[PDB]
Amino acid sequence: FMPVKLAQALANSLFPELDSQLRAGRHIGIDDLDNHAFLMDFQEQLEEFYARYNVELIRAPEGFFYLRPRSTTLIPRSVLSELDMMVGKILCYLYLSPERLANQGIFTSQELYEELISLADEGKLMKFVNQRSSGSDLDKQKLQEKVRTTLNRLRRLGMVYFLPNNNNKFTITEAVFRFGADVRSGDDPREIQLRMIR
Amino acid sequence: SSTHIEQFMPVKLAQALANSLFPELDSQLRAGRHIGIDDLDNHAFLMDFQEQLEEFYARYNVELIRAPEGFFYLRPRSTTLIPRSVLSELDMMVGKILCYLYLSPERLANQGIFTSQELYEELISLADEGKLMKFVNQRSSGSDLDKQKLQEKVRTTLNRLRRLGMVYFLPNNNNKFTITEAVFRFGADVRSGDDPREIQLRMIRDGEAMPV
Amino acid sequence: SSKSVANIIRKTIQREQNRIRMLNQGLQAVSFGQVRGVRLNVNVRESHAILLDVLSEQQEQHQDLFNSQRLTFSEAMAKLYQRLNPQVDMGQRLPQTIGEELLDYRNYLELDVEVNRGSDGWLKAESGALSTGEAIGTGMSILVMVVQSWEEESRRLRGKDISPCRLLFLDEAARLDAKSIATLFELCERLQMQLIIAAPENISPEKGTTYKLVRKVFKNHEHVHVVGLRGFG
Amino acid sequence: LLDVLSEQQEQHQDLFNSQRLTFSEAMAKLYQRLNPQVDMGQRLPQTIG
Amino acid sequence: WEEESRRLRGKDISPCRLLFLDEAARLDAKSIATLFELCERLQMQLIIAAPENISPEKGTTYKLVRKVFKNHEHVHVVGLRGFG
Amino acid sequence: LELEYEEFSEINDQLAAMIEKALLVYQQEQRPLDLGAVLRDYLAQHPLPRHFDVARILVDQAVRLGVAEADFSGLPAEWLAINDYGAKVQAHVIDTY
Amino acid sequence: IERGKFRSLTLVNWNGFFARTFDLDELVTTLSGGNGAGKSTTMAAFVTALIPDLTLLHFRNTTEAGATSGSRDKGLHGKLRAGVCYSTLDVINSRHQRVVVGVRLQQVAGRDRKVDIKPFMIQGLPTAIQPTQLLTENVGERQARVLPLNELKDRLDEMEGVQFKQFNSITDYHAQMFDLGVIPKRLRSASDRSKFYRLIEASLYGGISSAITRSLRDYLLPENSGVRKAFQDMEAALRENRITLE
Amino acid sequence: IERGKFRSLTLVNWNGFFARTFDLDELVTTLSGGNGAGKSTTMAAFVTALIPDLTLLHFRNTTEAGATSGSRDKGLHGKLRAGVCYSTLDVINSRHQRVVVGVRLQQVAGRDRKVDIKPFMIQGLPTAIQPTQLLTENVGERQARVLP
Amino acid sequence: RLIEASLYGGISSAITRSLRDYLLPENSGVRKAFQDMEAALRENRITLE
Amino acid sequence: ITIDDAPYFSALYGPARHGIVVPDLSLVRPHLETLEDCPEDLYLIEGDP
Ligand SMILES: Nc1ncnc2c1ncn2[C@@H]1O[C@H](COP(=O)(O)OP(=O)(O)OP(=O)(O)O)[C@@H](O)[C@H]1O
Ligand SMILES: Nc1ncnc2c1ncn2[C@@H]1O[C@H](COP(=O)(O)OP(=O)(O)OP(=O)(O)O)[C@@H](O)[C@H]1O
Ligand SMILES: [Mg+2]
């Protein structure tokens, strides 16, 4: 047999879509009203359903849901690039207090580009593009292209939402905290985030 | 009555989804693997609950299909919830050759065990060697380095076909392998003795195959 | 329209915060193992705080969306909420329902339970991060919170000279140490709330009434012999 | 079922005149063959055979 | 399980035996007496926990007290004995 | 440092011994036992702070001796006083030994 | 002023209790006895009399305290005995009115372990009459006879000023209990019953309840109508027009 | 034949314990103390030293027993302090051989509250050596230090 | 499972549900004879399918 | 207020039930001339709101 509430949950019309998304690694935040409510309602059974795949369904303390595979995962795994985590930690830093007054939650690609270039060390930047590179225009253009590419990957993960127009301006969701640092009693988030970025 | 499985789901479908074989199979199927007669467990499972699985997957806008040869596979629709991809032309050359090898009664005495060299020899016997070499490198003219490069590409594509379930390597020797009936999908353009253009149109209409 | 709605919402929020703050004080200095206090932490969600401020002071920037008679008020609220925080998605649900959700004040509040453990500050109460007795004590605390809230709620529908009864249980009470039981007795006494506790004789609280049970077989049937004591202290 | 499979036609046809045992029943278990109602999964349980 | 491994094990080794029980206070005196005689007849070791000393005349016992001390915590352990 | 030690007191076990010896006569003669009178007489032999423990132990010993047939009558028993300062007991007389 | 109190709990013909009445303390009542003596049984009686709903009632063992529904047995049937059984509470309001509330329990015959339950209430009883006396006949035999609801109704109606009310639905029973100040909230609907039972059973087993923790705002905050009804009335003209157009 | 026995349990740098050694009994060992004293923590240390498989270890409260919860946190991390930690067992084999099994535990820096485990075993240790002293270095005036 | 059930005490739901798996041991002599019949029955499955 | 005291209070306050509480009543004196849009009889009371 099968638990009644589990059968009810997976009978719901929203399940196929959410399944598809989750398997891809997308994170469900409070923004997605219906999906988030659905997970809140049926967590106790969905956790068991996905445990059958050797994959863990976790609700982050901030509120967003996501899947974590074990070593014996039944779902084929894939892994992010170094530049990807660099950009992710940058976005976590930009989730700041003056952000509210600075941009009202809406950023641009240039903010991130310039922040990345200003805050990172040159050596790891060269390692990102190519070791043979040295402070040249074409290298910076390639790095811009790679930044746009990885930003789209992150949009796929649900970290960042593009505003619906062709231009590259976006808003940061709470789920970006997954890149963030460990927090200890009384520690300042800016300092610890910078400490890891260094 | 209320709080009763039948309210939300057919009993047979729930019974299938609760089976211990389902997660494996699901995972695989989604990845594009074909299922033949040799992997009994899976095949039998498929057979037992065919219609429930079909109905299930339908939710995704994907067809669970059964070829006449007895092998199952997934065909996504245009509105598919699951991504769809196409094979490379080299994969097709190796696919149609593996198909002719399966049919060949002349080699049936091998009991299905073939060697990469035999496959390669058959392929070069039929296709235009020097014109096919164009795909390995635009400057190829029959040099041995380029011939070894072709053999290595064949070795790589054959490994991809293994992941798709179209061929099984021996347990201890990787230079030898065995075929399965799933290879007959490479003959979908000629199984009926009719106008090739019309066949091709029919196939693209059904979502079986794309041009390049 | 506009400002007045914001004011009624703000006053309702303020009154709820104050009542919670009053309930909160009764639970100060409750000793349960290393736990030394319990609180109900109440906060306002940002996405709604900005909406409330906008509705209070920037109404001239959105009046087109409010006085358009082709759509109703709740729909106007939903559309304004989507205009702010544009990344929010809507699950193919009618804007009417989202509007009525915005009309319900409770949706603006975020609620947590916190404990003042040991040398540390205020921590969110997680079961896995507490001993057994601390968990039991915290549970009792939250339960009395609920009971007090419900009595305050209903009194506007009850007679002026009626005060409902209050009673709670505890099974396998042996799990609590003497200090914790003293704390629990103090709480219930200060709250005029009755208790019934079961223990396999390991605990002998001097105050209150005690019943001794013994099960026997009599004329080939199960029978329970009962004795009672009270008045000590 | 072990008695059904163990004892064969030629000698035990004189034994088979009992109402409980017959040959066809081995194929009748083909119905049971397809899927028993096992619940928890470890190692590999499959079927009546 | 011990009987199953009789074949694989060397002849001269008998494996150790040990079990736990938290919140032993849920059991009354008669039940604990039963449990002790069972485990001793089987050469079975036990580790049990209870807020109050539920077993005064059998085995060893330790008493734990936690002290807050210079903005951290420290546990003090003292033994108990049946008679004095 | 090295582990210290602490010891238990056997005063309550001794108390149980005196009470059980004092109570054994009722069974041997099969004399009807009333908890009210017995508790009132027996509490007079100890000071007030110890009364509660004495009452508990005495009840523990007494209930093992037979049953009270009145319990099946549907008639509740009264709360008898057993000392000053206001202690009470509820129990039917023990008849069936 | 002068909060009400529960005065006593009575069991009739339960497993191990033919006829027993417990006099509850004003602050603390302690049940004590060896394993299997019947303590949890008494608390089962209390709560079943308080909330007579067979959909919610589930007396799982204390071990495995938090698991799923699991078995189809709710654990109540085995606590009854053949014949008729009762559970009753005696209460004193702030008005000092003596009200007796309870239920009648019976084992439904069959393969499965099912129970039948019927609530009732009595008002105006003299202070001189105890529940056990009402519910039993002192026939010549060694043991009395428990008398069904028919005999009970006839016996009570004979009394002067005593009223016997017998309910057909749980909702009515809870409404009367609330009106007399026996519970802190009037259980409008099944959802309210579920939350009240959650409260009681969470207190019974102990620990930080998962369900209470999930829905904290639903439990601790009252719902306010003022913010809404203005806009329902203002919205009315449009609603009617839209429906007419459709 | 003489069956083997567990001699003792040792904890180093756990939550509330710096370096403590419990001597087990041949039949029964009891732990007592008020709520929050640290009894369940001692249980957890023992079982961790017995089965270091981090996929399995899950220390629920005694309440909520039997509920398969999938909790976000397994409850082990908080029972450890910063720095290095140990948990070891001393056993007398049926062959009258003294063997010391154990694990080295250490918190992982990072937002996720993860833990690292490295098992080890010691054979032939002289009977006069106590694990508490073997695992620590005497630095300063009776102010010992733990060593990796 | 065994140790955890002992620690929290009581009738462990998982233990009782699969009691066969926990108590009854496995036998190699049975397997050695059954290897041949396993081959045969596999073949029959093939055919059936 | 409860249903029992509701009739008493409604009788007590009479027409002024729906007045406004304003603790000074001199701060309104300048505003008052502007009141052209109000119920024909407005009631004002002084006290701590
Ligand atoms: N549903 C049931 N079916 C059969 N027997 C039952 C049932 N419920 C309880 N019993 C038996 O009734 C007796 C009393 O059980 P109960 O749970 O009331 O004990 P208790 O005094 O609360 O024990 P403890 O405090 O140790 O849990 C025990 O013998 C128990 O086995
Ligand atoms: N994961 C954790 N994180 C933080 N503190 C913890 C954690 N686990 C336990 N503690 C704290 O450590 C102390 C010891 O808890 P523990 O459960 O070991 O005590 P105990 O004496 O067994 O108590 P009880 O008998 O009530 O279960 C308590 O203060 C508990 O709050
Ligand atoms: Mg019990």
Ligand SMILES: [Mg+2]
């Ligand atoms: Mg503990």
